[PDB]
């Protein structure tokens, strides 16, 4: 039976893969990291508070200058904040209110956003006019936009509810590459520090590593027991973390093709909204459905701290390029800058 053959070859190949990974599990991450002095205790405080959104904030992305940041909110606003003064730089009117993601271009000249409008909208904030206007709209996705990220001012990658990712040439509006393979809505995207690869997260409970050049899905990482909503690369581009509704975060290592640690506690049953690494990657921060964010010891797998201030869920969070600060977007309509 032509079908039964594949159904079995697929299973045996699965065992083979499983055997390969087990064979590499010669030591545990905790085993080699038990000789690292624990982080101890981290008490980060809110040093600044961005107040201007009238409804709950959905996403946010720091700019390269580690000073400015954009955030999209249910109030139909896309604001660019100056984290230092708390002042607003720009405040673009969103044609929709169901915005899911927003990104900042590295050059700081553009920003993007997307949502149930199934379109990634690019805005220019460095216009020679002094007024932000939609420089381009990237229709193409047949599902909602869950995440988008600027490679540079010409290309952007976006993940969609249509279960695929795409790379776009912003200028022409063309879709230079489509990344398929996932079998559930892709929720997140994170570019490798070298821009040659990117990890994705989907409702199929797995994460996938991709080669931006050949559009191939080089590796698939199983583990989670439910929707993975957050994906984030490790500072050296050889590992990355995840955040699923299974109430756990997991660090997978590309080269060892498997999970190295689970950041959980029988005391935490809420799902993860977003995750990010500190500059040295030693710390792993994560936002939950609860009012708090956890600060984890990436290597010792111990919770070293908490960020407690928001009155509602923390939906998004990130760390500056200089690693100097952490920012979090909540449903309480506020953004808090920590350190």
């Amino acid at each position: 039976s032509e079908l039964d053959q594949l159904r079995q070859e697929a299973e045996q190949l699965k065992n083979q893969i499983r055997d390969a990974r087990k064979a590499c599990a010669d030591a545990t991450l905790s085993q080699i990291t038990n000789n690292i002095d624990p982080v101890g205790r981290i008490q980060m405080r809110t040093r600044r508070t961005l107040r201007g959104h009238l409804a709950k904030i959905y996403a946010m992305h720091w700019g390269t200058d580690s000073r400015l940041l954009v955030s999209a909110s249910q109030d139909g606003k896309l604001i660019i904040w100056d984290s230092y003064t708390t002042n607003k730089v720009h405040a673009i009117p969103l044609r929709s209110s169901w915005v899911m993601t927003c990104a900042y271009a590295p050059s700081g000249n553009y920003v993007a956003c997307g949502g149930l409008d199934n379109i990634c909208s690019i805005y220019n904030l460095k216009t020679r006019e002094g007024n932000v206007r939609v420089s381009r709209e990237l229709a193409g996705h047949t599902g909602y936009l869950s995440c988008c990220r600027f490679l540079d001012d010409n290309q952007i990658v976006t993940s969609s509810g249509d279960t695929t990712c795409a790379l776009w040439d912003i200028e022409t509006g063309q879709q230079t590459t489509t990344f398929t393979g996932h079998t559930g809505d892709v929720m997140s995207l994170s570019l490798a520090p070298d821009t040659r690869l990117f990890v994705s997260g989907a409702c199929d409970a797995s994460a996938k590593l991709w080669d931006v050049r050949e559009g191939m899905c080089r590796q698939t990482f199983t583990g989670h027991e439910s929707d993975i909503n957050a994906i984030c690369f490790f500072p050296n581009g050889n590992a990355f973390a995840t955040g699923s509704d299974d109430a756990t975060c997991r660090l997978f290592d590309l080269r060892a093709d498997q999970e190295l640690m689970t950041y959980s506690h029988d005391n935490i049953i809420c799902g993860i909204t977003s995750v990010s690494f500190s500059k040295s990657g030693r710390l792993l921060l994560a936002g939950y459905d609860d009012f708090n964010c956890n600060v984890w010891d990436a290597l010792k797998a111990d919770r070293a701290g908490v960020l407690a201030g928001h009155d509602n869920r923390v939906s998004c969070l990130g760390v500056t390029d200089d690693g100097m600060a952490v920012a979090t977007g909540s449903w309480d309509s506020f953004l808090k800058i920590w350190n």
Binding site: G143, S146, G161, D227
Partner: peptide, 13 residues
Amino acid sequence: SIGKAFKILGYPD
């Protein structure tokens, strides 16, 4: 599919 997004946007059930 779209429900997942509604969940995220803050909608009951």
